Symmetry: C3
Subunit: 283 residues, 3 copies
Amino acid sequence: GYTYEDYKNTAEYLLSHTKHRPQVAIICGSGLGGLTDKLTQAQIFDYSEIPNFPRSTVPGHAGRLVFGFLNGRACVMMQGRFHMYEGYPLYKVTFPVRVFHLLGVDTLVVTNAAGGLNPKFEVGDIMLIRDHINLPGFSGQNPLRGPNDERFGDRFPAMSDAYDRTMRQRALSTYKQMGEQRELQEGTYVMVAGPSFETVAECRVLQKLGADAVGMSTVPEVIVARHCGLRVFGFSLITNKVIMDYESLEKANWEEVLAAGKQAAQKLEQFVSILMASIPLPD
Amino acid sequence: GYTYEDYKNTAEYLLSHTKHRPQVAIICGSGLGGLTDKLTQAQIFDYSEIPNFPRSTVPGHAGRLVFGFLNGRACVMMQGRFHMYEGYPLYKVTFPVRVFHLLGVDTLVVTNAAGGLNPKFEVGDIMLIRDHINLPGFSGQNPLRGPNDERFGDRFPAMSDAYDRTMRQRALSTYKQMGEQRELQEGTYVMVAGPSFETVAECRVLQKLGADAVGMSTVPEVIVARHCGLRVFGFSLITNKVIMDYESLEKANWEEVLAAGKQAAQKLEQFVSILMASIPLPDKA
Amino acid sequence: ENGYTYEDYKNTAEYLLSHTKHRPQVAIICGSGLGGLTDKLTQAQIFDYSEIPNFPRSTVPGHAGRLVFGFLNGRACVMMQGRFHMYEGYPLYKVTFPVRVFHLLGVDTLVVTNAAGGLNPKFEVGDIMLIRDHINLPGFSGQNPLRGPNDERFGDRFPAMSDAYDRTMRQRALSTYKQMGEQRELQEGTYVMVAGPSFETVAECRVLQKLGADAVGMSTVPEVIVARHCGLRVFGFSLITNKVIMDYESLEKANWEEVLAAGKQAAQKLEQFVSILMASIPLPDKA
Ligand SMILES: Nc1nc2c(CN3C[C@H](CO)[C@@H](O)C3)c[nH]c2c(=O)[nH]1
Ligand SMILES: Nc1nc2c(CN3C[C@H](CO)[C@@H](O)C3)c[nH]c2c(=O)[nH]1
Ligand SMILES: Nc1nc2c(CN3C[C@H](CO)[C@@H](O)C3)c[nH]c2c(=O)[nH]1
């Protein structure tokens, strides 16, 4: 895989090529690339020009790294991400997270599109990620598998406090004081590898396990971020309701997923701006 | 693993070495190879003579591809299949499915032996597969992993309609007018990788997940078939009741599995006959 | 698919047999913080894993990385002082390599031990849970040490695991233990393997509870599958080293230092238990 020097080489490339010094990294998921629009003094790198960066092969993933200020805050944004289903091993999927750490980032915001498993969710809802279920992790697909480098973190990091409690309370609070539009949802995200969508029986499995939303990303990035000590916040856009009975003739499809992101673009933009305000400055 | 041209080469080899032109492909699982017996005008290929075909290493898997007519319908049958527990990557396990598509097949019938998890099933029951749970797929073992080729299908295919609803309706109706003793069962098949058989605690996990029958195949072939637009029908022969308590001195074993297929041969042969009568003809000949 | 040939296992076995006069009947694999179980071996002869042909290396704290032959309560034993885990980067054929070596040495009984997180709310830190059964989550998805061509010199293509943990040993150990006036009962339950190396989320803890697991760890199962495949009698137990976090209010977190400390606290109870255990292992039919 990647040596420590590989991560350092990439971080040094970025640090040499930009004056931006980000505090927060944001990973934009399927159809959420629009979150880069409000960056000021934006500087763009195509992933292809960044040493060791994988390529985004999925539609709705632009494949660019954008530095700028978001609500005055120094950010770096992955406009597009990587997925196991593309053929990438998790050490590639998660590579940018350790680079961000080496750039000086102290907070990772992870975003995604997700299928709703909890019947109370509607398409267009934002679900705050309170926790996850790492199904690939259980079987061996964990980005920390292999020799541990103490320069990044511990051999056996805990994940029970992965999603930052303070930011979650603040976000929930702020959306109470609105009382406008749908309320902010909260729940458990389960990662499945994909790329095919779930059967009805699989939908019922994931529900029985206690997941509220399902997708094919995010969890590995969180694990790596927590290993290197980043504060983590996550949310899903619920882009479709997972099919849960044999009567329906509806089927999950990627077109509908991207369409739901386009529709929620302004709402997501607002949410992320309020989010930045809840991140404390470094010491 | 395989290039688009690899699939092409194999399909052209077959198209150039037989005049048979199948509409239906049938994959015969453990102890089910006898389903080939009623083929008329049979032409046999050993897998070893077919470019790019993997080899069947499991007992009760003959490793032959047979072309012929089954109750008057033009079929190609896998007498034996491949399993990930043999060492094969899923792109090898499922290779033939994409070949079948290129041969002009529009329907895939997948068969297997399976261990009964639903206590209402008896050894010798046929269970129609209404749905599946893909446990390896959750963790990354899906035959679609990697770059997608649009010449086969979509990057993100849906699976919630994988097992053709109309065929299942017709098979159930037709079978319940034939007044046979044991009813035709219907349920959810769960794939596990194996090759070791389940513990009691594992059996209870699978039951809790909602599975009726468990085996170690089939699901990857269905995913690949649905990706390329094939109509899919599946059934399991329940060959053993999975062990469910710590008192029992009985154990799952492969010999009992094959024996159950032997005993069920006449019931299978008849089922497969009314199955063929439930497969739509193509719009144009 | 397995990276080792039959001859690789043979070579390692012959090397050991030609470098010690010890001829073990019982192999014992010592888990995290349980390496002290070797302290009571008499006539102990130690090999570093690094000097044994084909042996993997233990890279985890609390795993010494030594193979120790000797007598335990009068019985000929070989003990792995430290083991290997999938999370270290090893394929399962490497993790489980020693088990087939033990079979070639003449061992007929494998005792597997580990530290484990408690999922059953009745367990307390320091409890010994006898393993009645396991749930092999990596196995379901393809990570099984038997994957690939099968060598009938070791065992069957499709071995059963429903009787993996020897009932008779478990009945004898429980009975003997009960008659010795110990205040805290031996526990008994199902161990679930997850790959790690990160510890469980609360949601994951709840999944594992709902699946019927009593304790969770990151080892053991592969070794048992290989042991049963080649016909070894198997006994297993876990030291419950921590209660897995199961609510969002707690500020406590699983951590490896506390895991190792729990093994230190339990050294004496574990020593005494492994003695009752050795007395519960049948002798071979012939000497
Ligand atoms: N597993 C899964 N993932 C998603 C997603 C998340 N991603 C959306 C994209 C395919 O549209 C993949 O990267 C998965 C949205 N809806 C679903 C769903 O119903 N199921
Ligand atoms: N997992 C599992 N599979 C089967 C099967 C199906 N296959 C039968 C064959 C071994 O007998 C393997 O390819 C699995 C029958 N019974 C069982 C069972 O109890 N369990
Ligand atoms: N998964 C898991 N394993 C353990 C273990 C067992 N091992 C202890 C060591 C990390 O301390 C790893 O090899 C796993 C103890 N407690 C726990 C737990 O809470 N969870």
